[PDB]
Design a protein around this motif. Structure first.
Motif, PDB file in Angstrom:
ATOM      1  N   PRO A 116      -4.509   4.712   2.335  1.00  0.00           N
ATOM      2  CA  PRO A 116      -5.505   3.631   2.217  1.00  0.00           C
ATOM      3  C   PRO A 116      -6.581   3.900   1.180  1.00  0.00           C
ATOM      4  O   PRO A 116      -6.984   2.968   0.470  1.00  0.00           O
ATOM      5  CB  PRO A 116      -6.096   3.526   3.633  1.00  0.00           C
ATOM      6  CG  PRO A 116      -5.801   4.835   4.278  1.00  0.00           C
ATOM      7  CD  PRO A 116      -4.506   5.320   3.678  1.00  0.00           C
ATOM      8  N   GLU A 143      -7.158  -2.923  -9.851  1.00  0.00           N
ATOM      9  CA  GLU A 143      -8.497  -2.999 -10.408  1.00  0.00           C
ATOM     10  C   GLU A 143      -8.537  -2.412 -11.814  1.00  0.00           C
ATOM     11  O   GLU A 143      -7.765  -1.515 -12.160  1.00  0.00           O
ATOM     12  CB  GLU A 143      -9.503  -2.247  -9.533  1.00  0.00           C
ATOM     13  CG  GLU A 143      -9.622  -2.764  -8.114  1.00  0.00           C
ATOM     14  CD  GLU A 143     -10.378  -4.077  -8.028  1.00  0.00           C
ATOM     15  OE1 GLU A 143     -11.267  -4.318  -8.873  1.00  0.00           O
ATOM     16  OE2 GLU A 143     -10.079  -4.873  -7.112  1.00  0.00           O
ATOM     17  N   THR A 188       0.829  -1.201   0.000  1.00  0.00           N
ATOM     18  CA  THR A 188       0.000   0.000   0.000  1.00  0.00           C
ATOM     19  C   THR A 188       0.865   1.254   0.000  1.00  0.00           C
ATOM     20  O   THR A 188       0.557   2.234  -0.687  1.00  0.00           O
ATOM     21  CB  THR A 188      -0.943  -0.034   1.202  1.00  0.00           C
ATOM     22  OG1 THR A 188      -1.821  -1.165   1.070  1.00  0.00           O
ATOM     23  CG2 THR A 188      -1.775   1.236   1.305  1.00  0.00           C
ATOM     24  N   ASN A 242      -5.457   3.309  -2.508  1.00  0.00           N
ATOM     25  CA  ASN A 242      -5.154   1.911  -2.789  1.00  0.00           C
ATOM     26  C   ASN A 242      -6.394   1.028  -2.861  1.00  0.00           C
ATOM     27  O   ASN A 242      -6.264  -0.171  -3.139  1.00  0.00           O
ATOM     28  CB  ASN A 242      -4.184   1.362  -1.736  1.00  0.00           C
ATOM     29  CG  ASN A 242      -2.731   1.645  -2.080  1.00  0.00           C
ATOM     30  OD1 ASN A 242      -2.084   0.861  -2.771  1.00  0.00           O
ATOM     31  ND2 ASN A 242      -2.216   2.775  -1.602  1.00  0.00           N
ATOM     32  N   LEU A 243      -7.591   1.575  -2.636  1.00  0.00           N
ATOM     33  CA  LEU A 243      -8.791   0.761  -2.790  1.00  0.00           C
ATOM     34  C   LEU A 243      -8.957   0.284  -4.229  1.00  0.00           C
ATOM     35  O   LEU A 243      -9.552  -0.773  -4.463  1.00  0.00           O
ATOM     36  CB  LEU A 243     -10.025   1.538  -2.331  1.00  0.00           C
ATOM     37  CG  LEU A 243     -10.160   1.710  -0.814  1.00  0.00           C
ATOM     38  CD1 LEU A 243     -11.333   2.614  -0.446  1.00  0.00           C
ATOM     39  CD2 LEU A 243     -10.299   0.350  -0.132  1.00  0.00           C
ATOM     40  N   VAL A 244      -8.416   1.023  -5.199  1.00  0.00           N
ATOM     41  CA  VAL A 244      -8.499   0.639  -6.604  1.00  0.00           C
ATOM     42  C   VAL A 244      -7.205  -0.024  -7.090  1.00  0.00           C
ATOM     43  O   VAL A 244      -6.992  -0.146  -8.297  1.00  0.00           O
ATOM     44  CB  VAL A 244      -8.870   1.835  -7.497  1.00  0.00           C
ATOM     45  CG1 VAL A 244     -10.194   2.446  -7.052  1.00  0.00           C
ATOM     46  CG2 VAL A 244      -7.757   2.882  -7.494  1.00  0.00           C
ATOM     47  N   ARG A 245      -6.346  -0.466  -6.176  1.00  0.00           N
ATOM     48  CA  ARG A 245      -5.102  -1.105  -6.590  1.00  0.00           C
ATOM     49  C   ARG A 245      -5.398  -2.408  -7.322  1.00  0.00           C
ATOM     50  O   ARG A 245      -6.186  -3.233  -6.852  1.00  0.00           O
ATOM     51  CB  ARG A 245      -4.200  -1.377  -5.386  1.00  0.00           C
ATOM     52  CG  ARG A 245      -2.845  -1.959  -5.783  1.00  0.00           C
ATOM     53  CD  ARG A 245      -1.804  -1.842  -4.678  1.00  0.00           C
ATOM     54  NE  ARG A 245      -1.723  -3.047  -3.863  1.00  0.00           N
ATOM     55  CZ  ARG A 245      -1.987  -3.103  -2.563  1.00  0.00           C
ATOM     56  NH1 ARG A 245      -2.355  -2.030  -1.882  1.00  0.00           N
ATOM     57  NH2 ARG A 245      -1.863  -4.265  -1.928  1.00  0.00           N
TER      58      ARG A 245
END
Lengths: 413, 413
Positions: B233, B241, B203, B236-239
């Motif tokens: 954080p 994707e 992250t 990185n929710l779309v890491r």
């Protein structure tokens, strides 16, 4: 820690009370260290008296014009022997200290004697579990169908047993913490606090987390640890203080995250609204009833069925002398699950912190009592609301008291 | 990180743009590693061809009944030579990777060229600083006289550059964060998130904090670090994707504490409401204007005078290609101080995270753009409110928009 005079004067009565908790007090090892300590003490005093006596003889030899080098050597030899004895004594006193810091608190006599959770006693229960005319869905399923719960994202960001919440589910989590803080500060007389989420070694020793529970904490490489509960920073606000009896009770509350490395699955990071009270020794059993009622009020205002249990000696935590647990009804599991714990800590923490109160009637000081409880664990309260207020179509009714905190929303989804 | 094709095709144009930031791009060291890499590549392919050729000869010798041990030895020798070349190649590719991860983002052409903060440009200002007919008190003094600020307690609990807030001062700090979250979620279209405050290595690499800024982070001995900002954080929710172009823009907000080990004195722990946007490449300059306006709205609704500055190349942060800073008026210092920073990060983070968007017009994917800003730093906003709304008697007028969040209070003290 326990009163050192209690351990010295009646070690067998103390060992009896601790046995009720399942703790073996090694009275023999402690008594041996106490005896060796007294011997070393006498030894250093004897050596000191010899050193002062030899100094007088050196002075006489000087006045006579004699050679004092053989006398000077022996006095230097004595000073080294005295330093070696002082080193041994300080090591021995630190070993006694180490042992004393691992001893749990003495339970109150009224606490039921038992070995584990099966001997805890239910003392009351409130509310009636809702009867559902449809199949009951669990909180994870409910969270996923409202796109407000993502454990997979949390594993990607961090690891297992962390949670990401989104949208209306996160908003309800937030609304719960604001409702709780407002209730305890506006109605119950608690003062609000913003505290650090990192603390130093002395703070952890003060409340009892160190040394026994170092392994339950996240430590940061400035030698800090993440707080396992707001009890740690809040209670240490009175560390080393002498408080005027008229200033008591000090009632503090805070909303913090809690970190623990290690029915309802426990996360490494979760939110809690914590209640802490600093009180006069003779008021702490009354304060525990007051504080437990404050936690119950939260459950009652949210309309959640619960039961109150008094923990038996074998199930209590390290620092508690008496504990009430509140367990909320979890529909999808058809049983109650812990949601709050309120404890009277007696003078256990105050003694480590040297938090005392002054009476002014005679200006003599004594240790305060400390109490702590959660009102409530926010994430666990969220699970209870989601499951007890679910509708047949999966929507969740927003409890009445939370609506002002959620821009008037009546339903989720 | 930067496009690897840009570094290979025009290293000199890239080195020119980076020089504007004060970053020396070692084009010679990189080109040498690239050449040595290509040589090793050819070497392993040549050895592979030799190994396959010698295998054919072994097969012929078998059919003739000859001894194949001298041939078997050479093929084993070749397999070791090939493993040594592959080890050298993988070490060399990791060294190139290390260097590439320390290269800052390319500034946008429109960004003023400059060496430091003295070359930043003021582009607008809003509001007029209040004229005081009494001597102006600073925020620390104001906090202490309302018994809501205790730096000494924070040192006792933790250490220096931490803060404890109590009573109405803590309540206003809380009210500010709720007002901000409500504004961005109800009015500006951001989705609320509860995220972990601990994150893993991937992250931190994703958003650019690692490797260059490891020393600014608190690390916990489960190899985690405390978040320096919710940007880490949230972004990185779309890491990893692939997002459908019609799902963009993704607008996320969160209220988190921020931790940094390292006018207004910066704390190790402070609260921020963070705004993050995932957008199509051609929309990111527009998104930056939108996001900056969201932060400005907070200042305007609170009635705080501010100025907007565009940072010059030499004052921008590692990942930004364009940044606006908002500086709020601080009466006791008679100047403006930073309170918000909104940046367009271009595809810098998306490239490390492999966050791509799919068009469906041709089903081809490209990197998204990411943006982040604070709206606002809560503790710094509190300092501005306290100083700009102080009265002659030391009381503090509660701004109109915060009154609903503070049980109708009109004044503090």
């Amino acid at each position: 820690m326990l009163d050192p005079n209690l351990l010295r004067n009646e070690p067998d009565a103390v060992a009896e009370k601790l046995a009720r908790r399942g703790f073996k007090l090694d009275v023999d090892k402690l008594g041996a260290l106490e005896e060796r300590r007294k011997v070393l003490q006498v030894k250093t005093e004897n050596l000191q008296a010899e050193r002062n006596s030899r100094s007088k003889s050196i002075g006489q030899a000087k006045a006579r014009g004699e050679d004092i080098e053989p006398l000077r050597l022996e006095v230097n030899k004595l000073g080294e022997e005295l330093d070696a004895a002082k080193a041994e004594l300080d090591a021995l006193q630190a070993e006694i200290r180490d042992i004393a810091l691992t001893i749990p608190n003495l339970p109150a006599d009224e606490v039921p004697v038992g070995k584990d959770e099966n001997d805890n006693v239910e003392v009351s229960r409130w509310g009636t579990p809702r009867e559902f005319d449809f199949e009951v869905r669990d909180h994870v399923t409910l969270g996923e169908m409202h796109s407000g719960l993502d454990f997979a994202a949390a594993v990607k960001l961090t690891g297992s047993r962390f949670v990401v919440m989104k949208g209306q589910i996160a908003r309800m989590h937030r609304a719960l913490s604001q409702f709780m803080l407002d209730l305890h500060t506006e109605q119950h007389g608690y003062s609000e606090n913003y505290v650090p989420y990192l603390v130093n070694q002395d703070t952890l020793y003060g409340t009892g987390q160190l040394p026994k529970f170092a392994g339950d904490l996240f430590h940061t490489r400035s030698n800090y640890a993440l707080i396992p509960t707001a009890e740690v920073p809040l209670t240490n606000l009175v560390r080393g203080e002498i408080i005027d009896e008229d200033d008591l009770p000090i009632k503090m509350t805070a909303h913090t995250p809690c970190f623990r490395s290690e029915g309802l699955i426990r996360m490494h990071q979760f939110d809690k609204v914590e209640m802490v009270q600093i009180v006069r020794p003779e008021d702490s059993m009354a304060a525990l009833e007051e504080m437990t009622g404050h936690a119950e009020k939260v459950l009652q205002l949210l309309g959640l069925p619960y039961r109150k249990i008094i923990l038996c000696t074998g199930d209590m935590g390290f620092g508690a002398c008496k504990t009430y647990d509140l367990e909320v009804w979890i529909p999808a599991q058809n049983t109650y699950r812990e949601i709050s714990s309120c404890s009277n800590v007696w003078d256990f923490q105050a003694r480590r912190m040297q938090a005392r109160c002054r009476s002014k009637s005679d200006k003599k000081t004594r240790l305060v009592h400390t109490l702590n409880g959660s009102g409530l664990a926010v994430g666990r309260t969220l699970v209870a609301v989601m499951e007890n207020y679910q509708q047949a179509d999966g929507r969740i009714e927003v409890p009445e008291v939370l609506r002002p905190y959620m821009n008037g929303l009546e339903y989720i989804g």
